[PDB]
Design a protein around this ligand. Structure first.
Ligand SMILES: [Mg+2]
Ligand SMILES: [Mg+2]
Ligand SMILES: [Mg+2]
Ligand SMILES: [Mg+2]
Ligand SMILES: [Mg+2]
Ligand SMILES: [Mg+2]
Lengths: 112, 52, 116, 101, 137
RNA sequence: UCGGGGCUUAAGCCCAGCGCCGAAGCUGCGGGUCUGGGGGAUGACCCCAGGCGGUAGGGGAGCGUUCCCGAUGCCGAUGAAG
RNA sequence: GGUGAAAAGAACCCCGGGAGGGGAGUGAAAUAGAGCCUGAAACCGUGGGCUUACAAGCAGUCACGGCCCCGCAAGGGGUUGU
């Protein structure tokens, strides 16, 4: 058994959230919760919110118990990118790429 | 644009290698005297309080 | 009538890119593979001629090291056989030095007497 | 009984009946053919002349057939010259039977 | 298909060096260093015999050599071309003279460096009394 | 620094000798192809021998994409194209 | 420029500020779910097999061996140590 939870179209760089994700991959639920809590990063908030929802989905829809699930796997995906202009010296016009994320978090039953 | 310029498109392999030490490190926490909550060492905490 | 480039190219490319599968970096992900193949192509052909030469000498070291153990040069060994008129021991099957050494030994004895 | 035998320009020892593969030959599908060419044996069949006199290694032609298609390809730099070409060698499935010297 | 050898126990050897010409001796040591002497040769696996030498200082050398022969040690630093005559090597670590000999006749490849290990050298004699010791000339 | 290790009644130089290594040159076995030649109501195809590196360049034979006749046909939900 | 035969365009519950998801439901089809048919390539990412910290290079090719995977067997595929 496993429960997914995706957060598409999140305004933030992939490489940036990848760091946060790589921290909790394969971690106990409560253990991960505390990591995101006091972890000094912006990507923390977006991973914590979705991961939190992954638990709700795991419970209210998959008969999984809160006290026995973990992160079977998780990963962020690169969504589209919001290209913007940028006034540069001597009139050069460089495009800036405000990328987006696709954080995925899948929980799972532990053992027996 | 000026004198400093990359001579060659760095190989994807060589790039990833650079970000070797790039990996983060999990924060450190400890169970408090109050709740079972995990406080960072040498600190107070919300929803728990402190003494003296 | 217009003829779109259509699928023609994509098939030609992936066709090649599959052949180049296994290589390194872009060298196995693009037209770079094509270049690499030309080298590999001419490498296979050249190393095909080499493959004979490789074993030619491969056996010779076996042969020479073998009869040198009995007590004679490779040139001495072969000269005797070329004289005794025994095309039998093709340098490849001279490997007898490992398989049935007694046989190889008697072949040396023949060479010993065949010379003088 | 290590019996040598040259056929198809190449020669190789022969075990007492065993599956072998040799150059193509003008023989029936599953018939029999005798190779008078023979060198040595199991009990030191010293080959006086180039090839042993009275002796023969027989084997049943198990069948013909082509094999792996090796790919040849020439190329030359700074000059539009490239030759793709395929080639696969035919071979007979000589199943060793008799090995009487 | 040509014989495909397998794991083979290391055949050690005890080698003298008194009066032996530097080059002439190193030659045999190297050829025996790799399994090139045994008819079961295979450049791939590399399974040469463990050669151990003694009486290094005893090595002879023809004519102007103790004085003429020069060695070269170059550090990456400027002027670090430091060079040494043969006589000095015999004074300091003499075992070196034969090592740099065999080392020079070993193949340039990685396995060749693995072979250089198989080569032991001293001057006393008195080797590390292990077990094998098949004397030879 | 002779390519390097090394080499001194030589691993140097000159003279004579026998043996071997070593190319994609040659021979062996197999297959292509083109050319000339032979068998041949038998078109056919079998057999013999030789040529076959190759830029500009000439010649020759094919594969493949778009569309038309073939089509008021045939294949196609038991699955077309991609 | 293109959802689908039809809007039947996802009521209601759950996480959430929202966005977006997980159920449920419609549909023949939801990796047809909304700039949504088909979805190739570059490029980013997770999991798995093999591999690498004494090594020198147009990255391949030729041989041998080990490890992993398919097969009644011989054999074939992936990886790369030398
Ligand atoms: Mg500015
Ligand atoms: Mg850019
Ligand atoms: Mg070139
Ligand atoms: Mg034409
Ligand atoms: Mg669909
Ligand atoms: Mg393999």
């Amino acid at each position: 058994m496993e429960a997914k939870a995706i957060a598409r179209y999140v305004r933030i760089s992939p490489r940036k959230v990848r760091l946060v994700v790589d921290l909790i991959r394969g971690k106990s639920l409560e253990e991960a919760r505390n990591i995101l809590r006091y972890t000094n990063k912006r990507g923390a908030y977006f991973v914590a919110k979705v991961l939190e929802s992954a638990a709700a989905n795991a419970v209210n829809n998959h008969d999984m118990l809160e006290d026995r699930l973990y992160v079977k796997a998780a990963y962020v995906d690169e969504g589209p990118a919001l290209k913007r202009v940028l006034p540069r010296a001597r009139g050069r016009a460089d495009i800036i790429k405000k990328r987006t994320s696709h954080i995925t978090v899948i929980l799972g039953e532990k053992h027996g | 644009a000026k004198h400093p310029v990359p001579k060659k498109k760095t190989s994807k392999a060589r790039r990833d290698a650079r970000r070797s030490h790039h990996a983060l490190t999990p924060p450190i926490l400890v169970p408090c005297p109050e709740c079972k909550a995990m406080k960072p060492p040498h600190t107070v905490c919300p929803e728990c309080g402190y003494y003296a | 009538p217009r003829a779109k480039t259509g699928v023609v190219r994509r098939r030609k490319h992936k066709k090649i890119l599959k052949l180049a599968k296994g290589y390194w970096g872009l060298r196995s992900k693009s037209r770079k593979a094509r270049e690499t193949l030309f080298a590999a192509g001419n490498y296979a052909y050249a190393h095909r001629k080499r493959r004979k030469r490789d074993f030619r000498r491969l056996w010779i070291v076996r042969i020479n090291a073998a009869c040198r153990q009995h007590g004679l040069n490779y040139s001495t060994f072969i000269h005797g056989l070329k004289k005794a008129g025994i095309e039998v021991d093709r340098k490849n099957l001279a490997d007898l030095a490992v398989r049935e050494p007694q046989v190889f030994a008697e072949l040396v004895e023949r060479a010993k007497a065949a010379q003088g | 009984m290590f019996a040598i035998v040259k056929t198809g320009g190449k020669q190789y020892r022969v075990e007492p009946g065993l599956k072998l593969r040799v150059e193509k030959l003008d023989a029936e599908p599953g018939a029999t053919v005798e190779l008078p060419v023979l060198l040595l044996g199991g009990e030191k069949t010293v080959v006086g002349t180039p090839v042993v006199e009275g002796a023969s290694v027989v084997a049943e032609v198990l069948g013909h057939g082509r094999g792996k298609k090796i790919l040849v390809s020439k190329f030359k730099a700074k000059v539009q010259y490239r030759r793709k070409k395929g080639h696969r060698q035919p071979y007979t499935e000589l199943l060793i039977k008799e090995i009487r010297g | 298909k040509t014989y495909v050898p397998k794991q083979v126990e290391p055949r050690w050897v005890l080698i003298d060096a008194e009066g032996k010409t530097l080059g002439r001796l190193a030659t045999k040591i190297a050829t025996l260093l790799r399994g090139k002497h045994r008819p079961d040769w295979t450049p791939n696996v590399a399974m040469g015999d463990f050669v151990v030498v003694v009486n290094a200082d005893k090595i002879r050398v023809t004519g102007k050599k103790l004085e003429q022969k020069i060695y070269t040690r170059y550090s990456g630093y400027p002027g670090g071309l430091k060079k040494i005559p043969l006589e000095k090597m015999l004074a300091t670590h003499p075992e070196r003279v034969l090592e740099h000999a065999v080392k020079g006749m070993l193949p340039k490849g990685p396995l060749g460096r693995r072979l250089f290990k198989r080569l032991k050298v001293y001057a006393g004699p008195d080797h590390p009394h292990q077990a094998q010791r098949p004397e030879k000339l």
